[PDB]
Amino acid sequence: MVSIRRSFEAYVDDMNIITVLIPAEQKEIMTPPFRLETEITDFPLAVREEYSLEAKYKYVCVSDHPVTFGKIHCVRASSGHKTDLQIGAVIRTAAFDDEFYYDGELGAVYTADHTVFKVWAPAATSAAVKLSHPNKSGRTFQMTRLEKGVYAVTVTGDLHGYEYLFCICNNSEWMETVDQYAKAVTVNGEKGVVLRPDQMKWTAPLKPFSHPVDAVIYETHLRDFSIHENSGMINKGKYLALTETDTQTANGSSSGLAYVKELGVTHVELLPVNDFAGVDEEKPLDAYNWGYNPLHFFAPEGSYASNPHDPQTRKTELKQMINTLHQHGLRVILDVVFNHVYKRENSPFEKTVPGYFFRHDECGKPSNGTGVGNDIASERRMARKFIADCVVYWLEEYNVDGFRFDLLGILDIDTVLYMKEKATKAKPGILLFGEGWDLATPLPHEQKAALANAPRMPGIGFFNDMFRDAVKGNTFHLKATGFALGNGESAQAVMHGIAGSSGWKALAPIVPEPSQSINYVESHDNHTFWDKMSFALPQENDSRKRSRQRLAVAIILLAQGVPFIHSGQEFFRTKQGVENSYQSSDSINQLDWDRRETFKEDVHYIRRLISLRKAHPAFRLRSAADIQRHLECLTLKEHLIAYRLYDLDEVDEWKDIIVIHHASPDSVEWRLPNDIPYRLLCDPSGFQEDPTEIKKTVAVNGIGTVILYLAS
Numbered sequence: 001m002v003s004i005r006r007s008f009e010a011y012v013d014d015m016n017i018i019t020v021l022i023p024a025e026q027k028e029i030m031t032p033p034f035r036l037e038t039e040i041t042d043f044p045l046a047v048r049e050e051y052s053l054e055a056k057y058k059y060v061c062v063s064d065h066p067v068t069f070g071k072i073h074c075v076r077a078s079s080g081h082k083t084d085l086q087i088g089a090v091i092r093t094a095a096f097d098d099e100f101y102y103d104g105e106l107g108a109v110y111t112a113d114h115t116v117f118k119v120w121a122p123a124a125t126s127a128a129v130k131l132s133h134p135n136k137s138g139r140t141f142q143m144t145r146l147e148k149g150v151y152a153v154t155v156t157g158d159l160h161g162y163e164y165l166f167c168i169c170n171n172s173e174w175m176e177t178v179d180q181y182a183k184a185v186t187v188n189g190e191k192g193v194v195l196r197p198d199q200m201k202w203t204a205p206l207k208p209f210s211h212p213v214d215a216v217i218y219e220t221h222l223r224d225f226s227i228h229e230n231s232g233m234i235n236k237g238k239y240l241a242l243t244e245t246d247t248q249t250a251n252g253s254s255s256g257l258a259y260v261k262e263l264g265v266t267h268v269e270l271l272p273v274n275d276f277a278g279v280d281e282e283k284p285l286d287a288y289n290w291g292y293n294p295l296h297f298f299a300p301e302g303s304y305a306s307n308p309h310d311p312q313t314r315k316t317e318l319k320q321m322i323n324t325l326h327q328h329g330l331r332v333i334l335d336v337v338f339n340h341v342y343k344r345e346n347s348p349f350e351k352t353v354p355g356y357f358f359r360h361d362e363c364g365k366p367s368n369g370t371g372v373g374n375d376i377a378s379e380r381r382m383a384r385k386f387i388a389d390c391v392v393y394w395l396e397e398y399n400v401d402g403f404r405f406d407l408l409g410i411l412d413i414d415t416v417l418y419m420k421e422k423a424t425k426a427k428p429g430i431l432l433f434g435e436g437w438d439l440a441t442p443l444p445h446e447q448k449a450a451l452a453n454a455p456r457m458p459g460i461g462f463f464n465d466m467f468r469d470a471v472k473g474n475t476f477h478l479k480a481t482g483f484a485l486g487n488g489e490s491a492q493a494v495m496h497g498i499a500g501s502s503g504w505k506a507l508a509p510i511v512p513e514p515s516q517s518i519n520y521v522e523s524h525d526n527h528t529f530w531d532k533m534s535f536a537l538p539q540e541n542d543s544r545k546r547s548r549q550r551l552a553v554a555i556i557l558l559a560q561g562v563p564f565i566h567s568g569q570e571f572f573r574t575k576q577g578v579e580n581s582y583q584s585s586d587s588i589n590q591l592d593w594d595r596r597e598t599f600k601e602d603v604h605y606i607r608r609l610i611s612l613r614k615a616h617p618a619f620r621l622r623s624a625a626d627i628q629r630h631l632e633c634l635t636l637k638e639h640l641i642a643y644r645l646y647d648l649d650e651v652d653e654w655k656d657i658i659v660i661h662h663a664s665p666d667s668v669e670w671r672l673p674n675d676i677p678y679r680l681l682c683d684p685s686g687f688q689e690d691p692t693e694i695k696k697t698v699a700v701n702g703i704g705t706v707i708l709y710l711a712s
């Protein structure tokens with residue numbers, strides 16, 4: 001690293017403390033007293049303490065007046081030498097935050113007449129906006145510093161179509177960067193772009209969603225969903241593929257939009273659509289990536305658009321896709337990544353205000369609770385502002401219906417409750433949830449938005465890994481098995497999950513209310529359910545495995561809480577044994593519409609389970625108190641579980657409902673709790689056309705589920 005030649009060093013580590021570092025073989029030359037100078041300034045600096053390091057001697061000096069940011073400062077030694085005051089740790093202090101917190105809008109504010117530019121850089125000494133445009137003369141103008149450390153400049157003319165960059169001067173080193181609030185960018189996100197309002201109109205009004213336990217989530221990646229040669233869609237792997245109506249596979253099976261609507265799902269959860277790194281937008285087929293490498297939080301990814309060179313195109317297509325799903329009665333959830341950025345050192349945050357936006361350990365080095373290099377410090381006031389500003393923007397400008405927070409456990413509770421307030425006001429009924437794993441990040445345990453603190457985050461949901469592992473088997477030991485795979489040691493944990501995970505017997509509650517429990521058995525992370533089971537049960541044929549996976553679905557789909565499904569799970573999706581496919585090729589990640597064809601019958605079974613849940617509110621109790629009054633366990637053995645829903649007058653259309661889950665191939669007899677005749681609605685074979693009546697006892701033959709009901 002080349003660098004500015006300096007006599008010695010000096011940093012501002014607090015609102016009134018300056019740390020002076022002098023090189024070893026100069027200790028006797030560059031000595032105290034020291035003085036802080038600037039235009040019209042010259043005060044003395046007292047020494048509180050001094051001690052030697054391994055290459056330098058250090059002084060911790062104090063000043064009578066608080067340093068004033070925005071102007072260049074000079075530190076003078078008795079020997080006459082000088083050096084420029086650099087930025088220290090003062091940026092992470094509460095005193096600094098309170099002094100510079102800005103509540104207005106930031107970024108590029110457009111008008112056909114003129115454009116106003118604003119950026120928050122409280123510790124810088126200068127700033128400028130750099131404008132360019134293909135064949136149109138480039139210009140760079142100096143910005144003026146205002147209150148709260150905000151720099152701005154107003155440029156006359158219509159700037160639609162112009163590219164822009166900010167130049168921020170920190171520690172006498174100028175850096176170039178795109179606007180953190182950029183709403184449009186060039187190919188591969190090299191620069192931001194100014195664009196007039198696109199005047200997009202939303203023509204598919206949807207009323208506020210009734211309640212969380214009334215939803216059915218379907219997780220999918222935009223490229224995976226339609227890249228297969230037999231997807232029946234024209235815009236393969238693009239935003240527009242999901243807009244294509246009445247699409248079908250070669251053999252005539254339903255696909256795309258028509259397919260998702262037929263299944264009965266209510267919300268479609270998409271993997272990251274903000275601009276990320278990992279795929280060359282100029283040559284998208286050369287690489288693949290899930291999208292968890294944030295570059296620009298306020299703009300869309302380019303590889304999913306028809307044309308990534310025209311700044312407006314990607315925006316238009318994402319909005320059309322979303323509007324179209326709305327027209328067909330489907331809602332949208334956005335996976336968002338506010339816990340880290342890709343390459344911290346080159347990020348807009350770091351180049352504008354060095355060291356402010358990332359958490360640090362006691363040594364003064366970036367923490368790594370995320371495990372990928374950096375942790376965004378949500379607790380800083382402008383960071384919290386940013387996250388809330390971002391969530392509201394997507395809601396207002398893209399009209400989505402909820403968010404899935406990646407690594408929710410890294411964010412702080414106050415920031416989460418603050419954005420929740422603003423988001424629900426902008427869009428009543430949206431869904432808000434995430435993974436609240438306990439992670440090693442520098443925050444007191446009670447301040448993390450982790451699962452353990454669910455009681456303090458009402459209105460926020462969490463992925464239920466307890467229920468997940470109980471049904472499938474521990475996901476960190478390939479060979480481990482769960483109830484669905486034949487392990488009776490976890491049957492009680494399963495009953496707990498069926499009851500909404502809000503307390504059972506001597507088992508402590510996972511969450512306070514069912515609306516906070518996202519029940520699932522598969523996701524984009526780890527082995528798919530089919531692949532994991534294939535490793536744990538190496539001696540079982542395909543027929544038996546299929547029945548165990550259908551069993552895992554019935555357990556989840558008929559449980560109290562919020563059901564969540566991984567795209568392709570319905571037809572035993574496989575990834576060739578790959579455990580972490582974040583960058584694998586298409587042959588590994590694509591949604592196989594050939595397999596959806598082969599197992600149309602098993603997909604039909606899932607479709608019927610979703611229809612049942614929808615037609616009977618008994619499977620959708622609104623609170624822990626109500627569940628306590630209408631749900632009770634009847635039988636609980638190593639391979640057999642039976643519970644029932646009762647007292648369903650005002651509630652359900654049926655009077656009594658009994659559900660039996662069997663996890664072994666043998667055949668057994670089960671005694672009903674009474675002698676009244678019931679209707680056999682379903683058994684290990686599947687649903688029955690025109691229910692037959694049985695009395696006192698019923699047979700449970702092989703792996704599967706049997707459902708009995710009594711009408712009114």
Ligand SMILES: OC[C@H]1O[C@H](O[C@H]2[C@H](O)[C@@H](O)[C@@H](O[C@H]3[C@H](O)[C@@H](O)[C@@H](O)O[C@@H]3CO)O[C@@H]2CO)[C@H](O)[C@@H](O)[C@@H]1O
Pocket residue numbers: 290291292293370371372373406407525580582
């Ligand atoms: O290139 C940077 C980074 O890439 C790799 O990390 C990726 C993980 O391997 C991959 O599993 C994925 O992880 C994310 C989960 O899918 C998501 O559910 C949630 O848990 O967030 C995770 C990360 O934020 O994505 C990451 C990032 O691309 C590689 O392993 C790292 O060493 C490397 O630093």
Ligand SMILES: OC[C@H]1O[C@H](O[C@H]2[C@H](O)[C@@H](O)[C@@H](O)O[C@@H]2CO)[C@H](O)[C@@H](O)[C@@H]1O
Pocket residue numbers: 197198199200319396397398399
């Ligand atoms: O054309 C600009 C922008 O307009 C709309 O966004 C509005 C939003 O509807 C209002 O509620 C309020 O928040 O102001 C926003 C911006 O002015 C569209 O929703 C959006 O797609 C479009 O880009």
Ligand SMILES: [Ca+2]
Pocket residue numbers: 188189275276277278279281301302303
């Ligand atoms: Ca990109």
